[model samples]
Target: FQNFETLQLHAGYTPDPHTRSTAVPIYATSSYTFNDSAHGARLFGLKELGNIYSRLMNPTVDVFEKRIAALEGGIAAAATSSGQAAQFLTIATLAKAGDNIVASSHLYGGTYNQLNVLLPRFGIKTKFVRSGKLEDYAAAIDDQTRAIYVESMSNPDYVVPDFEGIAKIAHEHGIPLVVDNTLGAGGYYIRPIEHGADIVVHSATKWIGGHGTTIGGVIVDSGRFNWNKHSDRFPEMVEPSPSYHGLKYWEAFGPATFITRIRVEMLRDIGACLSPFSAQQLLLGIETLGLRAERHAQNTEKLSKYFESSPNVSWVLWPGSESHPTYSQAKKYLTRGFGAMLSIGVKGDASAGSKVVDGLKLVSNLANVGDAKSLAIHPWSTTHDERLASGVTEDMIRISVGIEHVDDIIADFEQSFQKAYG
Candidate 1:
């Protein structure tokens, strides 16, 4: 199909070659039955790559993987248990012991912690460049750098970096730009590949899952970077795999060189494969991503204006707002709009932020975004606490505005203000 809408619904499916099910059905088997004795060897011996064991791949997950890849303009995608798994596999595939990655400091708290504190324990290191300073991003790079990372829209602040600019920097230094597009604002909202992204990751648990019931993630490879050309920088992709009887992935998988090793090696060894059931839920979510996100963007713009004028507010940074620090970047990269999320600091302090979060009438104070119901949370005590100094907190509030009726969303805040401002 030439169009994305048709492709999202049906590109990855046809009548089941075996059972003739029109809908993709979960195979629900831990191990696949081989065609014959010879077929088992081909599946296990890396003669070809398909399911011998469910730990590596599955039929139901494959359709979702292929469908998301098609939607995000990738050659292929690897599905995992959550966005955290996708981020881990993508980085670990490139940076093993003694390697490092350069990153933007304006980040999701989970990502910042993973790189700053968790990666070092595993012998991988990170150097961070605070966002907005082009020089900081450049200076953070050195010979040991494996990749450059940024969020399409940052977590609490919802800032859009000069993604194309950042990718140009990464490319100049012979590295790939890896963007976490969970706040991807939906594919129609923005596709990083269209700019300069080499690889993309998604928290399919968020917008892509829409229902908030399923947890899954995916890594999309643009398939444009030549892993062979950057062989010295990414030896793992081109080198021998001692565990797999000397298989060299770049030679074996061609265009899918990077992700092939991520699946064959990391997913095989560490075991973070996405379950087929979660894949089914995410596939259902993708059916309405375009529609839900449109409403979200529209609501976010209205909410930003409402919050900015409220006496109980400190300040706001919605990508839709012209006052945002990354407004120019958003204008260039996120043509669809700033999206449904915005950060606000209550007029008082960390205590006020908490009071506001606790006082929400309709908005659920949960650690998620892009759901159909409005949600709010205080990041200082949750997402940002680990990154701050001892006994210190920031007065930040995160809003995950949903596709609810706009009037109800605003009214919830009006009542919440009565309690929070006191």
Candidate 2:
């Protein structure tokens, strides 16, 4: 069960005792029936843990949550409607109005907007560090800083930050290190928790649901951070809650406090839980995660090499390559392979990125990554309009290399490049 391949399929589920069904059943009902008034009171009072409503928790989603938690080497997990919801839930649970989170500027456009624009509207601020340097993160932290955020391997730039270094800094400031491990491919490539991260969040829509069939997200708690020790910095975790009848999460649940609060409070009130149907789909996708990730990494390696030698290619950025600036850090942090995502600058005018995308017959030009089929996108024109400062260049073509044969993948890009540069 320690191995990822085994854990993905078997960690969270057991065969049905009554029906003998081997597969996980979708508990589709909106609410679970209580035994009687006392049972209902016990559930509502947080004296017992059982599913009360789908909006709060579902049996099917629970399996997915547990599977992800096991895969990421965490104590518990909570599933969400989308990756954005996962990020929001984590930040909301940790920080409040007038507080701030120090985060990497190199982020997914949606995440950047959420941290930079949306959260500020709620009276929360984000201090973005342009570089992955540990000193920059240390400098950004102050008394009101609640968490330090970064992507395990960033979005378009694919820079691999030093997780342990950042975690050390955050710990010194009495804050937790929150990581978006979406690009880490559902812990097949990397498990941030093992590297001192307190909480790990993912857009399971990508690598976790490798086929890109479901839009779900997950937050995993390492349960290692001592909330009581940093009670002043994170009063919400350590203090009594007015919403839960004077329950103190850190005192009651111990290591399970973070995920427990997210379930009982955040999901109960905010209501961004994942659907049972989507959870089933994501679970199925996860069954084959290891197999798919291997091919994705192999295909990306082949493609990155092809881009390097191609006459029409100006530059390629993939952490797997020795030429990349963060290759050493990537090697230290990433295990299986250097992920399937790579960005290249096509040699031509600004429109050259789109032209190559247009000429592709085998690859689909789309915004998504970690799909079963190859996907290409012109980030400057699509996902990152105002991202020149964040390292997204005008000619950058971001490619999510799929599980297809490496030769076919390279050939498609070769023909597209010829069409653009010829």
Candidate 3:
């Protein structure tokens, strides 16, 4: 079961003994019964592990947690209501008011907004490095910095940064390296921890759910960072917790400090918990992750080439292409394939890009990605409309290549381009 193929299916769960249910059963109950008063008290005290409430943990979601943690090569995972919640939880747990985080400038619009606008309101400042260069990140760090953040593969730019180089800088500064591996799709393309990332995060709403049916997110702890080793930089990990009877997390839990506090403290207070049904759906999608991911990469590589060759498309940015700026880094970090996401620029203006979406018959025109069916979006008019300062261009068309037949997907784009431009 060491192979991902086996691990994806059977890693977290075994067949139910009473019902012999092969499929992972959704434990839909809001609370679980304990044997007696002492048992309930012990569970509440965290003396031993047992289910007390759904908001903190559920059997179905527990399996999802174990499976995802296994996939990402982390010791444990904490599931959240959405990708946004997952990221916010990570930030809230590690850093507080007056603390700062160093982040990459090239980020998804929502994430960019969260880091740039929202968190600052709470006094958690973010310093963004406009470039992917390690030197830029190193210079941005100060005494207030708690973490270094970047995406595994950039959103619209598709730039793959030097993971190890950035990790080295973070380690030297005694801060954890946090990676948003939503595009990495839970290690099918890349495992951030395998290189040097101390923590990994993902939007399970995307590839992990595959069908775009469920919204969920997870935080995976690599358990490599020594929070105690960097006491002054991460006081929350080293200091005694006021919430838990003066227990010091790093001293008591050791390597388990990060993930444990996230679950028992942050999540307990925030209450952004994933639903049992969504967990079941994500597990179903994960079962076919290996197969679907291969198809996604295959179809995307073909579509990227097709778009690049087209006269209607002014330019294409895909890691699979030799013309991309980060092709070599993408080659070094990503193994199974380049990835299923790419961006294109139309020959005309925003209207032309809008028309392309309007003319599409087969591919969907939506903000979502990593579905079994293809999706396209005009970021200028849609995703980044409010966050215009995020720097997405007027003519940029973001294409999320799906697992559909490659020829059919190409034909849909071809006909749409003809109707819009030709």
Q: Write the per-residue lDDT of candidate 2 for residues 186-274, one digit (tens) a residue.
A: 89998899998999999999989999789999999999989999999989887889998789889899999999989888988899999
What are the lDDT scores of the predictions, listed in order? 0.83, 0.92, 0.89
Could you estimate the TM-score for every candidate?
0.94, 0.98, 0.97
Choose 1 or 2, whichever is better by lDDT: 2
Model 1 pairs in collision: none
lDDT of 1 by residue, 1-422 (tens): 66666777886778766788977898787898888999899887889666888788998889988988888889999998889999989999879788899987777767877999999999999997774677788888888899999888877777687877888888888889999998874366678988889999988889888889988989999998888888878877788878688888889888898878777887899899988988898888887777888888888889988998999887887887777777888888777767778888678755888888888889999888878788998877765534353212477788998998889999988898887664
Count: clashes, candidate 2: 0
The better-scoring model by lDDT among 2 and 3 is: 2
Report the number of clashing residue pairs per model: 0, 0, 0
Q: All candidates: CA RMSD in angstroms?
A: 2.3, 1.1, 1.5
Give me the runs in candidate 1 sitting further than 4 Å from their true place: 381-395
Residue pairs with colliding backbones in model 2 are none
Compared with the true structure, what per-residue lDDT tens digits does model 3 show for residues 60-145? 99999999999888988989999888999998887899999999987877788789899999999999997788899999999999
Task: Give the winner by lDDT.
Answer: 2
For model 2, give the 10-residue run with minimal summed lDDT. 382-391
Top of the candidates by TM-score: 2
Runs in model 3 with CA error above 4 Å? 385-391
**Per-residue error (Å), model 3, residue 365:** 0.6
